[PDB]
Amino acid sequence: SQVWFGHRYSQFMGIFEDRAPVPFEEVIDKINAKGVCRSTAKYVRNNLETTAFHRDDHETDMELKPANAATRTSRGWHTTDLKYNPSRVEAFHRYGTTV
Amino acid sequence: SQVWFGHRYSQFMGIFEDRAPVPFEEVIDKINAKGVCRSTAKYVRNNLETTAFHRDDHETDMELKPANAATRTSRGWHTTDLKYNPSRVEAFHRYGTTVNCIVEEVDARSVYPYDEFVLATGDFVYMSPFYGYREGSHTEHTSYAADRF
């Protein structure tokens, strides 16, 4: 999220969202073997290799939490419940990543 | 693509993708007449006229290449096979543009009263398939500005 900050408000200049294919190794060794899932996502896209961090922080294996309840839906599991947006510095563009 | 570069990685801050209507002149004079398609795209959008280059490079007429094979699909032709992303300079925002010309044959389906139809991709064209200039064809329906047709 490219958050921009006015004086007594805060905008969104852009919210880029993409889907990362969880690689084979992370599935076999962390999700299946340990039941936890990493916080970094690295994949090919537009022929340019890309790598992304959660909250622009260091790499961390995170607890896989059951998805909250819903009707007529199959099971799911996530790790992060909220989105990350950068803290406020005035009259600036700041980018905030969630994975 | 707004690519940003860390120390030992590289991110995407944003990937803006849009569709450019290939104008009449480029179709009649380059694709139909010569079989090649330009590398620049200029069109109206959000009331602001916009112009875009391929790989942020000069204008070039490019060879129209048959689309790679696929099952249960009509023919298509493109010119660029890969996307352009800027080279790396550290701790910076860099924007990289790709423009791919595409000519593609599709089916079309209209139901009664036939004042509009669809396409195989799922795009509703808001004009009777029989609207035109000959024999009261201007009676037919087109919610489009008459210059576009």
Binding site: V44 | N68, H78, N100
Partner: protein, 68 residues
């Protein structure tokens, strides 16, 4: 219409490489380092300029204070 798999990972050698490094060093934080040097340059310019304006008029007082 594209290529899913392809990945684009991206004397005269001395200048370009060293230039790129320093531009990376400049980009480093450093925002205080250069600003500090610029403030020291403006400070030296100011005080030197005022000293010149104090020699332009009666140097012997500003140059020989104690014996004048």
């Amino acid at each position: 219409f594209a290529d899913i798999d392809t990945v684009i990972h991206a004397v005269m050698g001395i200048v370009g490489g060293v230039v790129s490094a320093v531009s990376g060093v400049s980009s480093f934080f450093g925002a205080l380092a250069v600003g500090l040097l610029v403030l020291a340059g403006l400070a030296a310019a100011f005080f030197a300029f005022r000293y010149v304006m104090r020699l332009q008029s009666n140097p012997m007082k500003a140059l020989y204070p104690l014996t004048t």
